[PDB]
Symmetry: C4
Subunit: 93 residues, 4 copies
Amino acid sequence: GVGSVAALLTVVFYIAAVMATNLYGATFPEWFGDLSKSLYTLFQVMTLESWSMGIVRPVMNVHPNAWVFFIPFIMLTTFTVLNLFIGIIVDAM
Amino acid sequence: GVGSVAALLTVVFYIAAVMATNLYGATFPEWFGDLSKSLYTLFQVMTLESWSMGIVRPVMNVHPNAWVFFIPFIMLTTFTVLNLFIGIIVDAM
Amino acid sequence: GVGSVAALLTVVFYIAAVMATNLYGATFPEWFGDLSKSLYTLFQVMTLESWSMGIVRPVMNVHPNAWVFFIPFIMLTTFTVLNLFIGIIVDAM
Amino acid sequence: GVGSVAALLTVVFYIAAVMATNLYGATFPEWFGDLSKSLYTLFQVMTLESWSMGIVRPVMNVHPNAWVFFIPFIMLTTFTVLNLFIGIIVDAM
Ligand code: NA
Ligand code: NA
Ligand code: NA
């Protein structure tokens, strides 16, 4: 069902944005200072846009293991979207 | 039908490019000064290319709510393209 | 058939790389000075990687209509790949 | 089978990361100094993120044929991922 996936992604996004605001908020305030800043940056990361050279590398220079957070977040959001976008398309057929 | 979608995308792109030229044109002339400049930049945004670090963040530094314009535009264009490209391929089957 | 598409793309890529070496080679030598340089840069453009902020905008500052070359090239290569990648996957099923 | 592909991708990624640490590690330590650094950078390359303007062009300025390594790696990982993500979804049908 498509309703489960959009909700699943919404929940994952709030937990990750809390976790990111918590973990990296003090050291990276512009990208992770708020829940709302983090939601936006995690969205950018989901679009694969400058995620490594722009966000994750400058973070790993302070939090060398930040990659265990962001890579799986990516693999998770990316997968869920394809199952989601295909979900709506196929469901009407 | 596939014909509905390509027209839909053209309409959405002109409304958004008018809206973007109107909203951000005076403060960001190189990216939004004309209809034609905006068409091109909104296209870039559709390709997810440097959209956050290159366009939307520098805009939000002047228009902090610019994210309510660009994120939905993205989620919309990205969705319609996948439905369109799949649409034609299946249409021949 | 999948054999037609891989060849079609190969031909389009040589014509476009000749045309790009011809049109922009003198004014943008590092990206378009050779056939082989252009093949590589057009490939980057096909991957949507920094294509606008990195290549096409600096070019349009010299060739303002360069967008009539690169945007359709993009829409063409992007479409042909999806039909191609789906082609092999479905063909074995 | 979907199990074959995830293992295939892991093997390809370790061979490429050994090869990249070996080939480019001494001249590009931040991106290729370790197995683990290379795993991360090769992953970034798989996401098409700043791979040309950020990694491959600065490398080709030292290793002009670095393109015979990275382009095929890309065409390979990108292909296997699409076959993998589609693989699981269809597998449940
Ligand atoms: Na992309
Ligand atoms: Na990108
Ligand atoms: Na990018």
